[PDB]
Design a protein around this nucleic acid. Structure first.
Lengths: 101, 109, 81, 98, 98, 101, 81, 109
DNA sequence: CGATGAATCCGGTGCCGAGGCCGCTCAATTGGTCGTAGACAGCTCTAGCACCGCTTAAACGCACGTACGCGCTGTCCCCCGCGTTTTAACCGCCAAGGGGATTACTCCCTAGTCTCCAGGCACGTGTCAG
DNA sequence: CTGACACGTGCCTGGAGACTAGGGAGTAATCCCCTTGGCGGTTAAAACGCGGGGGACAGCGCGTACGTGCGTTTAAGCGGTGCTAGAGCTGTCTACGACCAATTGAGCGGCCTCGGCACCGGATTCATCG
């Protein structure tokens, strides 16, 4: 039986580098870099699910999560670019996925 | 001994009347609701009372803590720098810039 | 009428009243007022925009008690209990 | 086979792994969970992780060495780039000093 | 009939209504929720509320009147009977003194 | 047609005329006396479900609520003086309805 | 006598190192040491007994990393992120 | 300035070392786990190391805040009555009799 | 040696909320299976506990001297107090229309089962990075 | 330095087409509750100038109470060894939650009354600066 984690996929991000090299990592930071993803996922999913129950719906997609991201940006009073770029990227990714239908 | 009597009356007799009247509170709430949007949002008749009962009771605790700190600092009056200590020790830092646009630029209702 | 800018809608006497509602300190200096105004408005802006977004997410236009209750709960301020 | 999920939305992390986490916390009034939420969440998380790694790696070299350490995560990109820091809440990273 | 399930378990509040809100937070993966969970919780909550009401009634008559109001719950009793106050430590209740 | 509120039951538990004073109730007393029950039944069940999920089960058979009440009575430094009595009362009630079958 | 009385095993050196770990205050009076120990022990008890209860509820008689990782979250203290 | 020189290296040691040694943590943890019951809880080999990295950092933060509060009062040293102010400003309710009984009376071993 | 503004108490008043009715229409029992979940006896191999000997870092207690907390006093300036003037809640009343709330319906996009093969997980290995 | 991570390999089961039923979300229709808004007449509260006083900041004196250097223990700590409690996976039988008829009274929604509390008017403790 196998275990499911992001240990390899975290090492699979952008490391090919010609102008800066340095595609390095270590096993000490693996634990924190893989706990970050889980923390963000749980934190935003909780708020998206709670926000869903207001409408009386029972479906989550491309909606409640986007409003959850907006709420977690407003609650932080972050710079507008931080949330704006992230949501624009998310819309681009969802459009790329749904292009092929 | 006038402030002592004023506080004695305020603590007990005025357990219903809020510090800031209803109409200015409604005006500021309506003004702030239309900030960062493009539509007159309207409101209800019982949400404003809940908003008041929340915000004022939230500020009272903070002021009590700040006054306790100021008294503990071997002082008798209260200064603004007392509030900053509680704000830092309780986290949730405010973007200094926003509060300014809120108190200064914002001008309507 | 001459001056209508925000903040002073929270009266100068409001700060005295809320600091006098607690029987610890009976005096305050000149700089207490702006800090109070900034703190109160900084909290209220988030606490109202959260309710506005939650209302608009479910269609509708008018805010309602459920939306402000949810906004207060999400603003880390816990109401009657 | 479309199982090449990396090239589906140009992302890297596998949407499925995030989707099981999504389905872990859902009060028994929702279910459903259309498959297009996982893509959104995974894209957001992927951008956050790529940005933090890219930021921290350059500074983790000036101090010396060529690896990434918990102190080399807490310093700089969390202290300098607080934009990707305040979103999570507290730091409490590791034995990374102050 | 045992429609008097309140009489069956010696309670006053209806266990079904408490089960309705119990089931509202089950985060899936659990389901089921045997009916013995509602009776225990209902009994505990009934004892808590009965004690609070009895104390507030005993202490309201000192001011006079025949009513229970938020002022007679927030102050007077909860600051005196803090045992049932701490369990819900975020009072911030209503138009009451302190 | 039908609603979810405890007004009738909340105005019923205490036996009136203990000395000659039937418990009165204002309009705003009901709001707090129902919000207390709502908050208790929400937080306690959340902390009783996050522990059954931890064990890896599917049923909450009141054995996953005893160790949630104990956790909530220990987290608040509340001495078991008034927690053991509540636990005994709840256990006595459970048997009452169970035995009747 | 000695009996390794509790709380002293967090010696004065530990408190001094904790205070001097930050770089704002380099002195400490005699009231700090008796307070640090009582501040620590209550939190440690409230974060250890929760994990012990969670470990006992699932059968078993030994405490694992997941139990303490749950207890730390429940004790209103967040972990690595 | 020996205090300043030692504080210079204290952070560098903090990157890898701990304030209280490992065995005086294993005991303490075992002794507290053994209370409120009558069984040997039989800890693991990683729970202790997980507990340390949380508790030590939490108290580093607490004392940092307390020292910041002490500096504000134009007082160079640090006193115990500064901790209580921070603790009550964070609404962190505590019990004093139980803490005194815990610290004063035990055997560890 | 009296005695201001008031320390609180008595004697009513009438104006709208809380308590007693009053039928009814779904929500809580009641019987009847049944197919998955929780229980539980057995086992096999893993890591937690307990002890020995040596070495060296680290907590520890004492003498001594200086840095710093605390009490005193002159000050002068900035906050409160009080009368007065300006504003603006606010309550009663009458429109006016936006948008909450219910129904019909119909078509899309999740749920679930059947079949496959290549991406991800668990071992050798060495060569540099703490 | 020495051991740990990036490179290389072998395998298997979980992510994928894929096809279908079946219900929930989008959307036009309809009316009536409820938000906003303008008028005004008393009338309370916030804003404002002025004067006297007490409270924050600042030097000096004092003395006790931390910080530091040094000799002296003392348990942290390594590596080894052995012993066994209990985590962990498997195979079998069954109790008890789930979904579906059928029945029936208890509480939700309106009405009707009568006192509870907001209110004012009057009689006085403590006190007090002459």
């Amino acid at each position: 039986k196998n275990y499911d984690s992001f240990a390899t996929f975290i090492a699979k991000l952008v490391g090919p580098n010609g102008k800066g090299r340095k595609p390095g990592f270590s096993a000490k930071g693996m634990e924190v870099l893989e706990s970050i993803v889980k923390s963000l996922a749980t934190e935003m999913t909780i708020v998206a699910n709670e926000l869903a129950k207001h409408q009386g719906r029972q479906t989550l997609g491309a909606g409640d999560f986007r409003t959850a991201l907006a709420v977690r940006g407003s609650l932080i009073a972050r710079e507008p670019a931080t949330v704006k770029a992230l949501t624009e990227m998310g819309e681009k990714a969802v459009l790329k996925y749904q292009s092929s239908l | 001994t006038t402030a002592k009597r004023l506080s004695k009356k305020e603590q007990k007799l005025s357990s219903t009347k809020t510090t800031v009247r209803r109409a200015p509170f409604g005006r500021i709430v309506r003004t702030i609701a239309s900030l960062s949007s493009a539509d007159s949002m309207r409101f209800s008749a019982n949400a404003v009372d809940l908003l008041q009962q929340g915000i004022e009771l939230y500020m009272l605790d903070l002021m009590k803590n700040a006054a306790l700190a100021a008294k503990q600092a071997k002082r008798m009056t209260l200064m603004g720098k007392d509030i900053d200590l509680i704000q830092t020790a309780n986290h949730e830092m405010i973007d200094e810039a926003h509060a300014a646009k809120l108190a200064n630029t914002s001008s309507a209702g | 009428k001459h001056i209508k800018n925000l903040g002073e809608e929270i009266g100068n006497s409001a700060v005295r009243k809320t600091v006098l509602r607690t029987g610890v300190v009976f005096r305050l200096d000149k700089t207490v007022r702006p800090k109070f105004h900034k703190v109160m408005l900084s909290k209220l802006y988030e606490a109202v925009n959260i309710a506005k977004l939650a209302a608009k997410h479910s269609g509708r236009s008018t805010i309602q008690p459920k939306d402000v209750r949810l906004g207060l709960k999400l603003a880390s301020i816990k109401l009657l209990a | 086979n479309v199982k090449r999920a990396n090239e589906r939305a140009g992302l890297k992390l596998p949407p499925g792994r995030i989707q099981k986490i999504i389905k872990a916390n859902q009060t028994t009034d929702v279910g459903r969970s259309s498959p297009t939420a996982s893509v959104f969440l995974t894209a957001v998380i992927e951008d956050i992780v790529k940005e933090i790694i890219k930021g921290a790696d350059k500074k983790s070299e000036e101090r010396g060495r060529i690896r990434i350490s918990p102190q080399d995560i807490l310093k700089y990109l969390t202290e300098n780039g607080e934009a990707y820091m305040h979103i999570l809440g507290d730091a409490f990273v590791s034995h990374g000093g102050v």
